[PDB]
C-alpha cells in the first residue's frame, strides 16, 4: 500500500510511497529526524523524530 508522504526542503509534498520504500530510504540515511512526514490518513505532517515518539518505534519497521 502506497500511503507515505514527506515534505522536501522546498515545501513540496512527495508521495505516496510504500512503507518499504520509506524503510529503504530511512536505512540508507536519507531521512533526518526533522523531515516532515505523514501517512495519507494522518492529521498533519510531523517531524520524523516526533512521529517516532508518537508511534513508540520507527514507523517503517515491523511492529
Amino acid at each position: 500500500a502506497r500511503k507515505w508522504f514527506y515534505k522536501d526542503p522546498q515545501g513540496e509534498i512527495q508521495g505516496p510511497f510504500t512503507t518499504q520504500e520509506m524503510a529503504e530510504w530511512f536505512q540508507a540515511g536519507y531521512f533526518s529526524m526533522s523531515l516532515l512526514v505523514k501517512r495519507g490518513c494522518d492529521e498533519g505532517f510531523q517531524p520524523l523524530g516526533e512521529v517516532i515518539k508518537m508511534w513508540g518505534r520507527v514507523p517503517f519497521a515491523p511492529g
Binding site: Y6, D8, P9, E12, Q14, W25, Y30, F31, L35
Partner: peptide, 8 residues
C-alpha cells in the same frame, strides 16, 4: 533511486 526532492 534517492528520495525525490531531498538530494537535488
Amino acid at each position: 533511486r534517492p528520495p525525490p526532492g531531498l538530494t537535488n
